[PDB]
Amino acid sequence: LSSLPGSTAPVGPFDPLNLADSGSEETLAWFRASELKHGRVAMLATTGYLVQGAGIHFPGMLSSDVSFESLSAMKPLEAWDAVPDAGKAQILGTIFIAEMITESKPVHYTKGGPMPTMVFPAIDFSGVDAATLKRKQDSELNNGRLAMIAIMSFISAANIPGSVPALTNNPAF
Amino acid sequence: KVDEMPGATAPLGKFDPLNLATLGSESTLAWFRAAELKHSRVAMLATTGYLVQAAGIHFPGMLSSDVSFESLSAMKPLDAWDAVPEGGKNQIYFTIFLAEFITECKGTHYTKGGPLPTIVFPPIDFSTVNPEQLKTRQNRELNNGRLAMIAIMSFVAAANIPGSVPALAGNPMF
Amino acid sequence: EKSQSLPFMNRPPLLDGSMAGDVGFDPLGLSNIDDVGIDLYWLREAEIKHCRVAMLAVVGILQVEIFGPAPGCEMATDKCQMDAFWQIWGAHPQYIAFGLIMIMMIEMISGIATTQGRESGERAPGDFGLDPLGYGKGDAAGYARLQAQEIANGRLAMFAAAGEIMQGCTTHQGALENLMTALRDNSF
Amino acid sequence: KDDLIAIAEKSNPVLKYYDPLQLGSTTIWGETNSATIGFLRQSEIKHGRIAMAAFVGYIVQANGIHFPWPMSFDGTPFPADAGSPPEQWDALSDAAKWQIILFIGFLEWFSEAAGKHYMRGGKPGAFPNFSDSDLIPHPVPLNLYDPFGFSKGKTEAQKADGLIKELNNGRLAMIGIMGFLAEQKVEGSVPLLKGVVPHYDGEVMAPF
Amino acid sequence: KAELEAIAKKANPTLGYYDPLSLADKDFWGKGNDATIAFLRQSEIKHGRIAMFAFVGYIVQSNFVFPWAQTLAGAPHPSADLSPEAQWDAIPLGAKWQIFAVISALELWDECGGGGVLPHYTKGRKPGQYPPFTLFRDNVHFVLDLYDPFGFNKNMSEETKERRLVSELNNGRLAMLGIFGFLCADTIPGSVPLLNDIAIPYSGQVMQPFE
Numbered sequence A: 001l002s003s004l005p006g007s008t009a010p011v012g013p014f015d016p017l018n019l020a021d022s023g024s025e026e027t028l029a030w031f032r033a034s035e036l037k038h039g040r041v042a043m044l045a046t047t048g049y050l051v052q053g054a055g056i057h058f059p060g061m062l063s064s065d066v067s068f069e070s071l072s073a074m075k076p077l078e079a080w081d082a083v084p085d086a087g088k089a090q091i092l093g094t095i096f097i098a099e100m101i102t103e104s105k106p107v108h109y110t111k112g113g114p115m116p117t118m119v120f121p122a123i124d125f126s127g128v129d130a131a132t133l134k135r136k137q138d139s140e141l142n143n144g145r146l147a148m149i150a151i152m153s154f155i156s157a158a159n160i161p162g163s164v165p166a167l168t169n170n171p172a173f
Numbered sequence B: 001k002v003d004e005m006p007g008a009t010a011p012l013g014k015f016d017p018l019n020l021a022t023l024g025s026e027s028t029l030a031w032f033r034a035a036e037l038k039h040s041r042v043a044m045l046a047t048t049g050y051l052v053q054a055a056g057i058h059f060p061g062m063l064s065s066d067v068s069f070e071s072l073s074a075m076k077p078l079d080a081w082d083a084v085p086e087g088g089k090n091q092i093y094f095t096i097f098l099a100e101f102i103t104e105c106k107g108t109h110y111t112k113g114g115p116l117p118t119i120v121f122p123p124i125d126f127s128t129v130n131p132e133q134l135k136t137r138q139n140r141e142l143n144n145g146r147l148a149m150i151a152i153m154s155f156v157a158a159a160n161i162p163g164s165v166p167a168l169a170g171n172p173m174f
Numbered sequence C: 001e002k003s004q005s006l007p008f009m010n011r012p013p014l015l016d017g018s019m020a021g022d023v024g025f026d027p028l029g030l031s032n033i034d035d036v037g038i039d040l041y042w043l044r045e046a047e048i049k050h051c052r053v054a055m056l057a058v059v060g061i062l063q064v065e066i067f068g069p070a071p072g073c074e075m076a077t078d079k080c081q082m083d084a085f086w087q088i089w090g091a092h093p094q095y096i097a098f099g100l101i102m103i104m105m106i107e108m109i110s111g112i113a114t115t116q117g118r119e120s121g122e123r124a125p126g127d128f129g130l131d132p133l134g135y136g137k138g139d140a141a142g143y144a145r146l147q148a149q150e151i152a153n154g155r156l157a158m159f160a161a162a163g164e165i166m167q168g169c170t171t172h173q174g175a176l177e178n179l180m181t182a183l184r185d186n187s188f
Numbered sequence D: 001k002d003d004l005i006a007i008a009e010k011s012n013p014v015l016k017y018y019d020p021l022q023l024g025s026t027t028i029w030g031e032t033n034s035a036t037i038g039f040l041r042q043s044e045i046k047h048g049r050i051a052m053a054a055f056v057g058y059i060v061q062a063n064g065i066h067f068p069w070p071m072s073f074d075g076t077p078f079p080a081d082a083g084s085p086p087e088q089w090d091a092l093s094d095a096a097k098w099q100i101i102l103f104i105g106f107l108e109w110f111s112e113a114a115g116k117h118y119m120r121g122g123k124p125g126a127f128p129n130f131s132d133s134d135l136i137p138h139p140v141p142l143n144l145y146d147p148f149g150f151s152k153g154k155t156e157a158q159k160a161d162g163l164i165k166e167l168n169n170g171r172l173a174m175i176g177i178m179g180f181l182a183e184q185k186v187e188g189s190v191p192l193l194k195g196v197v198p199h200y201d202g203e204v205m206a207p208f
Numbered sequence E: 001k002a003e004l005e006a007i008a009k010k011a012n013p014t015l016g017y018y019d020p021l022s023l024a025d026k027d028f029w030g031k032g033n034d035a036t037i038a039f040l041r042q043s044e045i046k047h048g049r050i051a052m053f054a055f056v057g058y059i060v061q062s063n064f065v066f067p068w069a070q071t072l073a074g075a076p077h078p079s080a081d082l083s084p085e086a087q088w089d090a091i092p093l094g095a096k097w098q099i100f101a102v103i104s105a106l107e108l109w110d111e112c113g114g115g116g117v118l119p120h121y122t123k124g125r126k127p128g129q130y131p132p133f134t135l136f137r138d139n140v141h142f143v144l145d146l147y148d149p150f151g152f153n154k155n156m157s158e159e160t161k162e163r164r165l166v167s168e169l170n171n172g173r174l175a176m177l178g179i180f181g182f183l184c185a186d187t188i189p190g191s192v193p194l195l196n197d198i199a200i201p202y203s204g205q206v207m208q209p210f211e
């Protein structure tokens, strides 16, 4: 609906297949939090491909035998493979605590409660001027909507060359 | 609704010898006005884009890294499109698609009780709010676009069949 | 009234949320057994004993596979505790038989306390009066939380102790290096 | 919150209250908004007070100011023979660094424990005097703020204006000391300090 | 809206009120029409009064410069090169940032409203009016005012300024295309005069070191 944030100027509310009424009100509330989490993950994913695809990398050693010199030498989609198994165990473990904490809030966002806020560091963001947070929620979703197309373009360019015309002769792809 | 819309002029009052306005519903006529106007605006850019590309005037200086603007100014404009790069035509087909996707999904569609498609980017649309002045202006858009629809069909009947028009087909561009 | 854990099923009638880990999870109706010396008292005492034995077995594995065996038992040297038992039995078998008869006297007394505690009503199932620090004296809401935390950690450790037996008797490695093997095998 | 707007209006009558991130309306540890707004005031005052001693302390320790006498049992003077003051913090010792840090750590401790706290009835930045509060068993002669007594007798309106020109000189020296250390690791980072700053090129944000 | 058409009664009664794009009834950024009609009024006032400031900056910067120092490095001017459009590049870059710092601060004071002394032009104030420096002068140090730093005017009657406001933007929009008859007269020029000027940086606005 239009009183919800993600409705904007060009297409708002954009729902041609009428997926918002395919379930109840709690289904749409699950759809919003999943769009918000797909957005935040892809914005970190579009930037993580753009940063590691250039050659920007941390100085030093990632582990005892794997430096950042060797991981930036590869394209990013297979740079995850040479991360140590104790390295992905540290990453996936803190995401597990992050996903468990934002689910275990006292009211679920599917039942009207809050969407996932920051876990560590746990800055409060409640009384941050609902008019300004309305515009910034739209820019979170719109930058999420664009980055989800972007990271799906980056994987499609990395395996099927010529799928996107702007990334054909790109050496990171 | 065909009495209450623009397009009615002084030589032919309501020109409909096949009565195709009242053939369908008002959504069928609203599709027809949205298709006359879209064919008008494409053919008006088509008649202009044929004449200023047959006049030889062009942008400076390189369209692609390999294709110059001046190499497409020498050939006919209907054969210049074959020499536009495939990545450039994909850039054109994407922005045309994203404009057609937006105008058919902006709220209260034209086949319903809604407005005809306006400027996608940037959204201003320059329209006069005076209904006695605006009605004549969109009467001017239609029959200028009606003449441009006949004009661009004359440009492709002169570039395919040699002859077919007296004031053309002597010209190495048309 | 429906079960909390299985909301398509009716609630089992002898489970009313009085015990600690009661969310109505009895689909087979085993709490309705009342015949071959077995009832809800016997099953709750069996659950609580399976809870406490498995809880001690998990940390009893994780103590030796991290810090080694106790002094006097340094002849083990195997991280697989299903194999390290047979090296202690190979050299000092008398202490295992000391514990196994000391368990035998304790368990036969606990078997009398279960059946006399069932015929009378002066003993909760799994209750032995072993509260020497005295957590049960005050804050009955905070004491029912400890009763639920015993059951919740004990039901979890039942899977863990049964797994460490079975994936110790089949891989012959040890629990923590079965865990490192699985981490490198299923990494993505 | 009502007094934070009244403070920042007096610091700048053009820019009355500036908050892009709206950090002034948050909590941190679930206290309340009015208690963390004294945390934010304390942390801004402490950041500016440290940076403004750091800016004077930079230009003294960047030029050759090695004062006698060296206070050691073997020799080992103040290591200005590099010079380049981010290098000169590294060349102290390893064990001399814990004496500097833990002594400031008492003043960080005493500002929290003693007379009244900034996440309460406030006055942030007000260092409690060592004469009172009965926690230190020495006792010590002087206080941190007014050791010689300069200047008691100033009215409230004379000292209410003091923190407002301490906050504005504290905000500028935050920018001031960081513009030095940015050129110690990337040059061209500040445009008007090219060539002056000798590119320490290590890690300024690590003690040992 | 109606007060805009009142200015066109005073500007050119032969032509009259004239919007071909009909922007006097549109709205920008969803902020309404009455804010849009004052953004449009301030923009061509600021377009005109910059162009009149550049029209006289094109007729004396060709013919007369002050010669003294220009920098602390010698070569003590960009060495005209009487074509004024081409004198901007070699000024150098360190001087262009100082120009772009004051105009960034001067236009920051305009949309401020003078620290809140005047209202905003989209919400009420007269569009050509620059807010005075009276609240900066009251606090930091004596700075001169932007419009009339000495107090020559405020001797006028009130009916004379609106006959000079209408003279200002009428002189403004002629100098908008008047100054665009000079830098457009240097790249495939197109005019009857011939001869004024020739050069080819053509626009926009900095040169060899950036991006």
Ligand code: CLA
Residues within 6 Å of the ligand: B002, B003, B005, B006, B007, B008, B009, B012, B013, B014, B015, B016, B019, B020, B021, B029, B032, B033, B035, B036, B039, B146, B147, B149, B150, B153
């Ligand atoms: C092809 C695009 C197109 C479309 C969608 C329309 C649609 C319309 N015209 Mg327009 N018209 C067009 C082209 C078009 N016209 C051209 C090129 C001319 C100049 C000859 C005109 C001259 C004209 C006048 C003077 C008037 C209209 C009017 C109308 C409206 C009347 C309803 C109707 O009968 O629909 C038409 C139904 C259609 C399905 C569109 C026709 C397409 C046909 C069926 C395809 C076959 C044509 C055939 C191949 C001949 C073309 C030869 C070619 C080589 C040149 C309707 C909105 C009237 C109006 O606006 O009333 C207010 C009106 O008075 N038209």
Ligand code: CLA
Residues within 6 Å of the ligand: A001, A004, A005, A006, A007, A008, A011, A012, A013, A014, A015, A018, A019, A020, A021, A028, A031, A032, A034, A035, A038, A145, A146, A148, A149, A152, A153
């Ligand atoms: C994770 C995917 C995802 C999800 C769950 C949502 C969910 C939502 N979107 Mg969002 N959207 C997305 C991605 C997603 N979107 C992307 C990538 C874009 C850019 C194209 C948009 C652009 C967009 C706009 C402009 C608007 C929405 C709106 C909405 C709300 C619409 C109501 C509804 O029930 O739709 C449910 C949606 C789904 C169940 C999506 C699941 C995926 C479907 C089933 C298949 C898609 C496959 C697709 C064809 C592959 C294309 C590849 C791609 C790279 C192009 C809902 C919360 C509206 C809104 O925010 O109102 C509050 C709104 O105005 N979306």
Ligand code: CLA
Residues within 6 Å of the ligand: A120, A121, A122, A123, D028, D040, D043, D047, D178
């Ligand atoms: C030059 C730039 C710069 C900037 C932008 C800041 C800004 C800040 N610093 Mg400062 N700081 C600076 C220079 C700077 N500082 C320098 C040069 C030093 C060395 C002298 C310090 C040393 C310093 C200390 C000791 C402290 C600060 C704190 C702060 C924050 C005060 C406001 C606040 O509480 O927000 C809320 C805070 C944030 C938005 C920051 C989020 C931090 C995330 C969540 C990570 C937390 C990691 C942390 C180590 C966890 C420890 C506990 C955990 C193990 C359980 C603010 C973000 C204070 C602070 O953050 O307290 C809350 C604080 O205690 N700074």
Ligand code: CLA
Residues within 6 Å of the ligand: C053, C054, C056, C057, C059, C060, C061, C063, C064, C068, C069, C070, C071, C073, C076, C084, C085, C088, C095, C096, C098, C099, C102, C103, C106, C128
């Ligand atoms: C399921 C429980 C269990 C079992 C079967 C074992 C068995 C073993 N342990 Mg392990 N261990 C356990 C739990 C267990 N442990 C716990 C909880 C810890 C602390 C975390 C350890 C820490 C540990 C270390 C450091 C070492 C062992 C070692 C051993 C082996 C030789 C020790 C021995 O035989 O003692 C003989 C038995 C006794 C001396 C008496 C047993 C206890 C009696 C029966 C009292 C029980 C009271 C009961 C718990 C509560 C009251 C019951 C009732 C009143 C309600 C043997 C296979 C050694 C080894 O060889 O490793 C390879 C070794 O070095 N254990």
Ligand code: CLA
Residues within 6 Å of the ligand: E010, E011, E012, E013, E014, E015, E163, E166, E167, E168, E170, E171, E174
């Ligand atoms: C429909 C026809 C029409 C009408 C009725 C008007 C009416 C008006 N015009 Mg407009 N205008 C028109 C067409 C028209 N104009 C055209 C075609 C042009 C382009 C040339 C202009 C450009 C124009 C400007 C720039 C201005 C006007 C102004 C005016 C108003 C006062 C004019 C006056 O009498 O002051 C008396 C006339 C003078 C005092 C002459 C002033 C001469 C100046 C100061 C010097 C000009 C340089 C000179 C030509 C050469 C100097 C020597 C040289 C060799 C160096 C009046 C409402 C003025 C205004 O809006 O103020 C209310 C105003 O500033 N007009």
Ligand SMILES: CC(=O)O[C@H]1CC(C)(C)C(=C=C/C(C)=C/C=C/C(C)=C/C=C/C=C(C)/C=C/C=C(\C)C(=O)C[C@@]23O[C@]2(C)C[C@@H](O)CC3(C)C)[C@](C)(O)C1
Residues within 6 Å of the ligand: A049, A050, A053, A054, A055, A170, A171, A172, D019, D020, D021
């Ligand atoms: C109160 C306050 O003040 O704060 C508020 C207000 C304020 C200031 C407004 C804020 C803001 C706005 C901000 C910070 C906006 C910044 C946005 C940003 C940072 C936008 C990056 C785009 C980069 C792209 C698209 C790269 C494409 C690159 C592509 C496609 C490549 O091929 C990369 C490349 O390497 C390779 C992979 C391959 C090579 O062959 C080619 C190269 C080398 C090129 C805050 C901070 O949010 C909040």
Ligand SMILES: CC(=O)O[C@H]1CC(C)(C)C(=C=C/C(C)=C/C=C/C(C)=C/C=C/C=C(C)/C=C/C=C(\C)C(=O)C[C@@]23O[C@]2(C)C[C@@H](O)CC3(C)C)[C@](C)(O)C1
Residues within 6 Å of the ligand: D018, D019, D020, D021, D047, D048, D050, D051, D053, D054, D055, D057, D058, D061, D085, D086, D088, D089, D173, D174, D175, D177, D178
């Ligand atoms: C366009 C816009 O909206 O902008 C907005 C954006 C934004 C971000 C939202 C806002 C904000 C908050 C900001 C800007 C926060 C940044 C704060 C900043 C810049 C804080 C540094 C403090 C330095 C410290 C603590 C220590 C120095 C350390 C010192 C002095 C020492 O320890 C000693 C030493 O030096 C010597 C003395 C001697 C040497 O031998 C050794 C060393 C070198 C170690 C604003 C205000 O709204 C503005």
Ligand SMILES: CC(=O)O[C@H]1CC(C)(C)C(=C=C/C(C)=C/C=C/C(C)=C/C=C/C=C(C)/C=C/C=C(\C)C(=O)C[C@@]23O[C@]2(C)C[C@@H](O)CC3(C)C)[C@](C)(O)C1
Residues within 6 Å of the ligand: D019, D020, D021, E203, E204, E205, E206
């Ligand atoms: C054609 C011609 O003849 O001209 C010639 C001559 C000449 C004159 C030399 C020319 C020139 C020079 C020109 C025109 C140069 C450009 C000028 C221009 C117009 C430059 C815009 C800057 C905008 C900024 C920095 C935005 C900040 C905005 C920010 C940071 C924000 O939005 C965020 C914020 O505000 C909010 C939204 C919300 C708050 O919670 C937080 C804050 C406060 C942080 C040319 C072009 O070269 C050629």
Ligand SMILES: CCCCCCCCCCCCO[C@@H]1O[C@H](CO)[C@@H](O[C@H]2O[C@H](CO)[C@@H](O)[C@H](O)[C@H]2O)[C@H](O)[C@H]1O
Residues within 6 Å of the ligand: A165, A166, A167, A168, A169, B064, B065, B066, B085, B086, B087, B088, B091, B095, B098, B121
């Ligand atoms: C509101 C409206 C929104 C409209 C959005 C429109 C976005 C347009 C983005 C276009 C970006 C073009 O990006 C560019 O693509 C071209 C192909 O055309 C690539 O061009 C490259 O590949 C093509 C083949 O595919 C070669 O012919 C060409 O020689 C080579 O340089 C460029 O490497 C890339 O930089």
